Amino acid sequence: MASGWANDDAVNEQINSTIEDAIARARGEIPRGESLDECEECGAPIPQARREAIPGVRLCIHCQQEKDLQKPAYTGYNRRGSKDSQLR
Numbered sequence: 846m847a848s849g850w851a852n853d854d855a856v857n858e859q860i861n862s863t864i865e866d867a868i869a870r871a872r873g874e875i876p877r878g879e880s881l882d883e884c885e886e887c888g889a890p891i892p893q894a895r896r897e898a899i900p901g902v903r904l905c906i907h908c909q910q911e912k913d914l915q916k917p918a919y920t921g922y923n924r925r926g927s928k929d930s931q932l933r
């Protein structure tokens with residue numbers, strides 16, 4: 846039974862977005878919460894078309910069109926909780 850085999854707190858914090866947020870403001874490696882210009886699959890030229898259509902695209906039009914099919918178009922979720930999602 847896979848329990849206490851690898852999933853630790855002191856290894857999950859590297860996986861946490863704290864690291865990428867630190868590097869984003871440190872050297873400007875990570876973009877401003879938006880799309881990139883190089884496909885994470887095959888390093889292929891990301892078109893501005895995919896960038897402006899999809900806020901945070903990581904797939905060139907070739908690798909994207911196949912995953913666009915695999916997009917569920919639903920959540921079926923239940924995450925009870927309130928947040929600051931406003932403009933004051």
Ligand SMILES: [Zn+2]
Nearest residue numbers: 884887905908
């Ligand atoms: Zn690609």
